[PDB]
Ligand SMILES: Nc1ncnc2c1ncn2[C@@H]1O[C@H](COP(=O)(O)OP(=O)(O)O)[C@@H](O)[C@H]1O
Ligand SMILES: Nc1ncnc2c1ncn2[C@@H]1O[C@H](COP(=O)(O)OP(=O)(O)O)[C@@H](O)[C@H]1O
Ligand SMILES: [Mg+2]
């Protein structure tokens with residue numbers, strides 16, 4: 001057996017570890033900081049780019065930039081910085097001795113995975129790598145070979161239906177709507193109360209407010225009429241400088257955008273209707289088995305009371321005789337990584353690597369042949 | 373290695389010494405005295421003008437002018453004379469063998485810096501020189517690498533925040549209320565008691581009265597009511613001619629003007645509101661450390677009870693959750709100069725000196741590039 | 745404003 | 752992205 | 759100063 | 766075939782720890798004597814660097830070899846910082862402020878070769894070794910800033926910044942790959 005690094009490195013937060021464990025060894029936000037003021041105190045040591053948790057702690061004087069947006073790498077230098085910090089600082093392991101199992105969302109541009117392979121082979125000199133689809137790993141982590149995975153990360157949402165292992169590639173529905181859009185929408189709607197977060201350092205504060213207070217309402221209109229007729233839903237959060245703010249109606253208005261993107265000015269259907277459409281695109285003989293094996297993942301599906309909402313919404317769209325099960329495990333946020341460690345620890349997986357030798361003779365165009 | 377000269381050169385008093393020590397070598401009132409009478413006896417010595425301690429010694433037959441006012445040099449001949457007396461008489465060292473680290477308050481006319489470096493390079497022919505902000509030097513001397521420095525010298529007051537060594541020039545605040553204005557206010561309020569000080573010679577007497585008997589009231593109106601109720605705050609000062617005066621109510625009415633400039637007919641806010649506005653102009657993620665690391669300096673912050681008064685005021689202004697601390701080292705009167713030494717003694721500083729070559733190449737306008 | 749910026 | 756959406 | 763205030 | 770070792774060890778050469786305190790032709794302060802011959806240990810190290818990085822076995826024969834090993838390890842740190850610059854007048858400042866930066870010495874965490882380097886025995890030897898290594902660093906950076914930068918475009922020539930990935934026996938004075 002061999003130890004193979006599993007680096008999820010989805011948008012939002014990079015989670016890297018070793019294959020064979022039950023939790024990623026190092027999880028840190030994938031951001032890169034740059035100082036935006038003069039240095040005046042010489043002799044204390046300075047750096048020109050902070051990465052990960054260090055960039056988060058010093059966010060007061062930095063311009064946080066995400067290298068990945070909507071599941072696509074848009075700045076490769078910062079991506080290389082993130083990978084270097086993951087390899088040599090978080091895991092503290094030599095990357096030229098271990099295989100690497102990276103993940104990519106479905107229906108992304110091929111140049112993305114091509115440049116990913118080129119970077120991982122020509123910069124870090126990994127002896128072998130493999131680019132897997134996130135939802136397939138999420139299904140691995142759930143310990144079943146049939147079901148529709150509904151993975152809603154921080155920058156992209158997508159559903160993949162699989163039956164007996166034979167994934168249907170013609171019913172994979174992708175939707176560029178995830179935690180970052182919800183964070184921006186919360187930043188927008190927080191003004192009407194009276195609070196204004198406008199700089200990229202305060203977007204982190206808004207994200208913390210979202211992931212600590214926001215939740216999904218089972219019946220949107222009833223909850224609106226309730227929180228608009230009584231002060232029993234307002235919650236108070238303390239900013240990092242002593243100020244306290246109180247949010248009421250906004251609490252469930254942020255995640256509700258997932259179920260009706262008309263708030264964000266988008267035309268696409270909600271995530272529930274997206275999952276239902278993905279199911280309905282499959283053949284008629286497997287739908288009943290998909291309905292009872294719906295799986296959630298990603299940290300955007302960690303909103304309190306989203307499983308019940310998804311069940312109540314799909315049950316309204318599916319025939320009255322199909323049983324709808326929303327298999328949402330309480331370890332959903334790390335599921336995409338957990339399935340990876342399961343995969344990279346298998347025996348036959350050693351025959352699915354992209355060996356460094358195989359790349360040295362064929363360039364980056366080999367990932368489209370060795371990895372679907 | 374050769375020592376480096378550190379000349380604080382603040383308005384009011386000039387502190388000069390060698391880089392590396394723990395205290396200034398020569399400290400003398402930065403005044404220039406010229407006689408206003410004609411000598412009638414020959415052979416006792418008649419000099420055109422005295423400078424420094426000699427002027428204070430013979431203040432009777434002299435008129436005293438300050439070269440620096442509100443941190444700005446307004447008379448360059450007397451300033452060159454001060455620097456000459458500093459180099460040749462007070463330090464007993466030539467300028468052509470030592471770099472010079474001058475200090476100057478922020479938000480000054482750039483012509484001041486230009487003429488300073490021009491005089492230091494063309495007249496004295498120094499090998500190199502540097503110009504530093506006084507608050508940054510105070511922060512150096514305080515051993516910290518983060519915090520807000522509230523400096524209040526004889527001529528100018530300024531607050532400068534720094535976080536992790538990154539000064540924020542967009543939140544640096546300058547207020548022209550300082551020691552000399554308080555001395556004039558004392559000369560004005562002493563009239564009610566009947567004591568009339570008009571000449572520039574007696575202004576030094578008034579200054580000594582101030583810095584020996586004044587003290588900051590923790591609660592102003594309560595101290596006023598107390599002084600009105602009983603005579604238990606009155607103190608007696610012994611004039612240098614043999615008279616005695618009693619002051620009980622002006623002792624705190626003089627420094628109180630720092631917190632209520634309306635006494636002097638100014639519209640600006642007090643020093644506590646100035647520091648609070650300086651803090652609130654910084655980003656929300658760094659205000660806590662600025663609250664917990666407030667640092668005082670300068671001579672005008674040597675009044676008894678100023679630290680407690682500022683702490684109470686800022687605590688009344690800041691949110692109740694934040695923790696406030698007013699670091700007031702007992703050597704703050706010289707703190708700025710201390711930092712100067714700590715700046716020039718570093719081994720990572722010998723690249724930031726303005727070399728004579730650079731000056732000859734780029735004119736006096738180089739100080740705006742090679743200095744912050 | 746109440747939080748963020750002054751107004 | 753290159754066309755449609757930013758990325 | 760030159761304009762505003764003396765210095 | 767063996768790598769390129771230094772041929773400057775002399776029976777009267779003094780030792781610091783177990784490194785030959787070899788004289789150096791420089792202007793910076795330090796405890797090493799001044800050199801009159803046209804080749805010191807730093808010139809020899811810069812001469813042998815480009816070839817010593819490809820070898821993968823290096824037998825320490827004397828103490829001059831340990832000094833040359835240190836300087837070969839430090840040229841790899843100078844190259845990392847010179848790769849980013851774009852003007853020799855900035856490369857010189859970068860090399861000065863790097864030579865000033867204190868690197869680990871034998872017998873401290875972070876030094877890659879504690880096993881094969883005798884740490885100082887007392888405080889005086891510690892101070893002398895610190896000063897000697899600092900002088901070596903400063904002069905090596907000074908000499909290398911004139912090799913890396915070619916006068917045709919006054920920016921780091923690609924014939925020297927291609928050795929940034931090449932590590933001398935995969936060791937380095939900085940962190941493990943950082
Ligand atoms: N327990 C939670 N409750 C509510 N929201 C959460 C929770 N955990 C994460 N989120 C939000 O979901 C967003 C995206 O999830 P994330 O797991 O970061 O995506 P990815 O897996 O691609 O990194 C985050 O910005 C976060 O604010
Ligand atoms: N013990 C004291 N109490 C109050 N004020 C003082 C005291 N000592 C000095 N001062 C005042 O400090 C002012 C100048 O001090 P200093 O910090 O040297 O300022 P500058 O740097 O402008 O010369 C003078 O106006 C003097 O009156
Ligand atoms: Mg995910």
Ligand SMILES: [Mg+2]
Pocket residue numbers: 382383506524525526670708
């Ligand atoms: Mg001063």
